[PDB]
Symmetry: D2
Subunit: 149 residues, 4 copies
């Protein structure tokens, strides 16, 4: 089966492999040092930014990642948890990994006293949304960005 | 123009809280009064990256607008970004440029803070607000998902 | 102040005017033959395609236009009415002409036994939706078109 | 291995099967139409003087019906030619992801080409990702919002 747990120093390699695949998916290309910057934050206990990794109990191969972080809110005393990134190996999909990755964050946020978790996806991403409508719900909102950003 | 924007002061509480209450009525929600103090506390604390500004009528120092924003991380960049959480202008003070000035103020401060990436989100039914947002920004092709029950 | 009514032969020039302004708004260009084709169909009683016009009761200034037609549906025995076009004079806006034009269709559709009226609009058209949200409700649906069309 | 499904217009003999799918389609949409409407729709499909049609997806092996697509012709003030609207589309649960859905939409495209009315369109529920997974391949999401009269 599959299990999810926070990344360790040893998981850096498999995480970067998924991080690259993830960038390909989005058709983007981040600076190579941003990888090192992010992992540094996941490991720094004083920075509320984490990363969990899905691993197969048999092969023990890292098959999925989920990067998330904590931030404030004017609408409540408790902070919110935002899942920034989610990615499961194209060959390890539909096995329940994405769901177990999101569920892990739910459980972790509950322990942090910040259960209110949210995230966003591109509207045309129906593959991901098949999973999203099962673990959450589409907010009737529109996102606006500053021109050029 | 007779409308200027500026960060809140301890003396701007009464005005900000009134708009905060009216903002709540607009959203059909109701927050505990203790949250109003916590929010204002974070605004005033220079070491907490949560700010608030007010659109002030220059004729009379009457506060007619409110905008609450805060800084937060991102896995897509080394530097953080700004999220405009709340925006509200008095009914009698609408369509005078206050809304756009409040958003520009955040834009300017974002620039000074070295975190120019500013964003926000409105209800898909709020066309009055979007009439402005479409001029000062652009609609991102994204869908927002929330954890069930939240 | 403002009254709505089905177009007549004498409303041709006043209708073609708003037609062209409506075309400018959408940034498109239809041939002049379509102006005559559509208007022909409006006047022809056999064709279930209509057009109403908002007029200033003071004078006889055509300030508004609304084109609509009847079409089938598999979801009911009763046909539906689709409001294809709607344009109010740029100087006569926020007077209630739009609301009146849509209300007129509702009443005419009811007398036809086809009360189900609907229309679509650009997602970015917040000016029109400020009105639509008052006389209608946004369906939680997404429209798709054939590639190229 | 290869499925091999054939798509064709309904005949009086297809009634029983089409209706079975029509009912499942309603269960999916969580609606309930009177049995009379099923008869009316089929009546219109079979009537050549009424521009409403229905095609059905059949297995090449056994002439078992596994898919359905209901569509019709209507006017438009934006062109001389009319256009086509795919009102319904359903494929049996156990016959999905085998190319049936796409073939049905493609059949409508061809018939639209033959009729002189190539402009085909449809709409789906915003939350219907299973379907849009296919629609994005055969069509494109228009930047439009659908509005209906209150109570309807
Ligand atoms: C980052 C942002 O948040 S948005 C971008 C997210 N990332 C991506 O899109 C990257 C590319 N995609 C992926 O990595 C993956 O497809 C993900 C992460 C979107 C999903 O990961 P997966 O490991 O496949 O998730 P999971 O295993 O839970 O998916 C299976 C679920 O989808 C359902 N599903 C899949 N296909 C279908 C279909 N055709 N019809 C109905 N349900 C379907 C499954 O039935 C299942 O639901 P269930 O677990 O109750 O049975
Ligand atoms: C993230 C957020 O919190 S979402 C919710 C924001 N808050 C609300 O919606 C609360 C209720 N509404 C409000 O408080 C206000 O309507 C706001 C803040 C949304 C806008 O504030 P305002 O002070 O009225 O903004 P502003 O004066 O810039 O609005 C006018 C703008 O809308 C344009 N506009 C076009 N048509 C119209 C119309 N029919 N009515 C109003 N404005 C219109 C104006 O032309 C103008 O652009 P411009 O200044 O370049 O000419
Ligand atoms: C299907 C169609 O083809 S989609 C395209 C329709 N056409 C266009 O978009 C063309 C360009 N626009 C126009 O010609 C017009 O603006 C139209 C047709 C969209 C609307 O026509 P109008 O004559 O202005 O409509 P109407 O007079 O009813 O508009 C006033 C309504 O808008 C509301 N409204 C306008 N600005 C605001 C604002 N800032 N805040 C709240 N409500 C507002 C008014 O309150 C009012 O509602 P009410 O009549 O109950 O008081
Ligand atoms: C207007 C309309 O009526 S709206 C409602 C349409 N009807 C419904 O939703 C009823 C319930 N659903 C159904 O009957 C079916 O699931 C339908 C009609 C939506 C689709 O019918 P199908 O016969 O399965 O379609 P089709 O065979 O083309 O589906 C396969 C396609 O989906 C894609 N797909 C399926 N599951 C996935 C997944 N998990 N990830 C990525 N792509 C996927 C396939 O890649 C494929 O594309 P391809 O053929 O180029 O390889």
């Amino acid at each position: 089966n599959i299990t999810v747990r926070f990344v360790t120093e040893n998981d850096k390699e498999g995480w970067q492999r998924l991080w690259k695949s993830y960038q390909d998916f989005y058709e983007v290309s981040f600076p190579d040092d941003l990888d090192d910057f992010n992992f540094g934050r996941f490991l720094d206990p004083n920075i509320k930014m984490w990363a969990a990794v899905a691993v197969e109990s048999s092969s023990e191969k890292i098959i999925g990642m989920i990067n998330f972080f904590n931030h404030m809110t004017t609408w409540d005393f408790k902070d919110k948890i935002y899942i920034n990134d989610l990615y499961v190996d194209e060959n390890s999909r539909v096995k329940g990994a994405g769901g177990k990755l999101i569920q892990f964050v739910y459980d972790e946020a509950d322990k942090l006293g910040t259960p209110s978790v949210y995230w966003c996806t591109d509207e045309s991403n129906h593959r991901a949304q098949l999973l999203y409508v099962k673990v959450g719900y589409k907010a009737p909102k529109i996102l606006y960005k500053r021109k050029g950003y």
